[PDB]
C-alpha cells in the first residue's frame, strides 16, 4: 500500500491545491474513479467471445458467397538459395539484393519478387480470416465513430475546446463519457487479448507500441479526469480508422478499382486529420490553453510528451501510407 | 454546499471607489466558481461578474467591463469585487453566489447559481 500511495502522488496528477479527497464521490456529483476501469476487462473479454461468434456464423459465409479461397496461401516454388535468403538474409530484398539473386540464379527480378511475396503470404494467416478481422474492425469503428458524433454534437467544449479547462478538475462524469470510455478501452483490451494469447506467432512491432500508448493515455487520462479533451482526440482519431478496413475487405475480395479509390479516401482523411487537424486543434489546446487557464503541473509535461510521441507515430503511418498510395494513384491513370 | 456572507456595502460618491467583500463559511470554497449579481428597482436580476475556482478565468458583463475587478483568495476563503468609477446607473442591492457544480463556465444565468446570499445596498 505504500508503493500505491507513493505512485498516485496528489501533487503530482492533479494541479495545485487540489487533492484526491475532493473528487470522492458524493450526492451532488460524481467523479471518475479508477476502479469503473476494472469493468473494462469482463466486458472486454465477451467482446472477444462475440468477436468468434462474428467470425463464425456472420462473416464466415459473407466471405465464402463472395468466392473467398478458404485454404491457404499457395505454396513458393522450393528453391535452397531462397529459402536460405529468406530464413537468414531478409524477408524484403532491396534492389541490389534482388539483382544479385537473380544473377547468383540466372532468374529473372518478377520471379523472385513472386516467391518472396509467395512466402510472406505464407508465412501470414489464411486470406478469409483475415477478410473476417477486418469486417470486424470496420464494424465497430463505423459503430464508435457514430457514437462519438453523436455525442460530441451536442457537448460544449468541442466549438470551444477553453471549456476543457475552465472547471478542470471539478467537472462531473456523465453517463455517456463513462460508456465512450469503457468501451474504447474494452475494445482496446480486446485487441491486447487476440494479440498475446490468440496466436503468439504474431509480430511485436510499431502497432504493438501505439496500442499501449492508447491504452496508458485512456486509463490515466480518464483516472486524472481529462475525459473532455480525451473524447475529442479519440473521435478524431477513429475518423480515419473506417476507411481502413473498408479498403482492406475491398483488397481481399479483388476489386482493384473499389480499393484504390477507398485507399485514396482513406489517405486523405487520414493525413488531414492526424498531421493538419491533430497538431492545430488538439495540440493547442493541451500545450497553450491548458498552460495559460490550468498552468503548469508535473503531469502536464507526461501527457504532452506522450501527445508528441502519437504524433510521431502518425507521421511515420502517414508516411507508409503516402508511399504506398502514391503506387495506387499511377496505377489508377 | 457553502454559506456566503456579504460586507463592504454603504453609500458612495460619485465616481468612487468601493470593495465588496463576501466570505464562505466552509472549507469547500475553493471547488466553486464565485459569482456577483445585481438588484436594481424594478425590472429584474443582472449579471454583474464570475470567475471559477482558481480565480485564472474572470468574465463580467458588457456594460460594467473595464471598472469592476473580481477576484478571490482561497487562503482566507473569500472573493472580493473592486468597483472604480461608480455611476448613478449602479445603485442597487448585491448578491454573491457559486456555480452549482454543474452549470458550465460562462453561465449568465439566476438558475446556474445555487447558494445565494443576503446582498448589499450600493447608493451612488
Known amino acids: 500500500a505504500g508503493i500505491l500511495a507513493w505512485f498516485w502522488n496528489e501533487r503530482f496528477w492533479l494541479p495545485h491545491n487540489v487533492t484526491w479527497a475532493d473528487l470522492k464521490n458524493t450526492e451532488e456529483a460524481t467523479f471518475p474513479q479508477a476502479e469503473d476501469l476494472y469493468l473494462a476487462f469482463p466486458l472486454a473479454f465477451c467482446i472477444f467471445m462475440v468477436r468468434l461468434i462474428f467470425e463464425r456464423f456472420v462473416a464466415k459465409p459473407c466471405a465464402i458467397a463472395l468466392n473467398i479461397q478458404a485454404n491457404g496461401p499457395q505454396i513458393a516454388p522450393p528453391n535452397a538459395i531462397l529459402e536460405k535468403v529468406f530464413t537468414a538474409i531478409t524477408k524484403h530484398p532491396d534492389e541490389k539484393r534482388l539483382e544479385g539473386l537473380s544473377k547468383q540464379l540466372d532468374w529473372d527480378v518478377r520471379s523472385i519478387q513472386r516467391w518472396f511475396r509467395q512466402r510472406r503470404n505464407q508465412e501470414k494467416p489464411s486470406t478469409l480470416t483475415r477478410f473476417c478481422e477486418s469486417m470486424w474492425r470496420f464494424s465497430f469503428y463505423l459503430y464508435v465513430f457514430t457514437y462519438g458524433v453523436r455525442f460530441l454534437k451536442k457537448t460544449p467544449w468541442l466549438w470551444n475546446t477553453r471549456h476543457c479547462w475552465y472547471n478542470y478538475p471539478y467537472q462531473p462524469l456523465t453517463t455517456d463519457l463513462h460508456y465512450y470510455y469503457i468501451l474504447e478501452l474494452s475494445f482496446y483490451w480486446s485487441l491486447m487479448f487476440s494479440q498475446f494469447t490468440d496466436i503468439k506467432r504474431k509480430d511485436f512491432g510499431i502497432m504493438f507500441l501505439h496500442h499501449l500508448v492508447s491504452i496508458f493515455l485512456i486509463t490515466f487520462s480518464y483516472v486524472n479526469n481529462m475525459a473532455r479533451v480525451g473524447t475529442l482526440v479519440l473521435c478524431l482519431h477513429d475518423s480515419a480508422d473506417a476507411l481502413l478496413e473498408a479498403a482492406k475487405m475491398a483488397n481481399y475480395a479483388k476489386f482493384q478499382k473499389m480499393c484504390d479509390l477507398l485507399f485514396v479516401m482513406f489517405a486523405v482523411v487520414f493525413i488531414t486529420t492526424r498531421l493538419g487537424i491533430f497538431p492545430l486543434w488538439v495540440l493547442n489546446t493541451t500545450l497553450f490553453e491548458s498552460w495559460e487557464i490550468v498552468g503548469p503541473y508535473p503531469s502536464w509535461w507526461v501527457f504532452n510528451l506522450l501527445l508528441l510521441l502519437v504524433q510521431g507515430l502518425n507521421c511515420f503511418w502517414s508516411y507508409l501510407i503516402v508511399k504506398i498510395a502514391c503506387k495506387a494513384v499511377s496505377r489508377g491513370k | 454546499q457553502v454559506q456566503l456572507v456579504e460586507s463592504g456595502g454603504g453609500l458612495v460618491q460619485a465616481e468612487g471607489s468601493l470593495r465588496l467583500s463576501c466570505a464562505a463559511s466552509?472549507?469547500?470554497?475553493?471547488?466553486?466558481?464565485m459569482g456577483w449579481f445585481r438588484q436594481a428597482p424594478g425590472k429584474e436580476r443582472e449579471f454583474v461578474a464570475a470567475l471559477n475556482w482558481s480565480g485564472s478565468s474572470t468574465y463580467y458583463a458588457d456594460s460594467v467591463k473595464g471598472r469592476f475587478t473580481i477576484s478571490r483568495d482561497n487562503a482566507k476563503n473569500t472573493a472580493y469585487l473592486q468597483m472604480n468609477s461608480l455611476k448613478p446607473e449602479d445603485t442597487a442591492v448585491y448578491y454573491c453566489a457559486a456555480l452549482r457544480r454543474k452549470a458550465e463556465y460562462g453561465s449568465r444565468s439566476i438558475a446556474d447559481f445555487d447558494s445565494w446570499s443576503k446582498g448589499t445596498p450600493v447608493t451612488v
Open positions: 466552509g472549507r469547500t470554497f475553493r471547488t466553486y466558481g
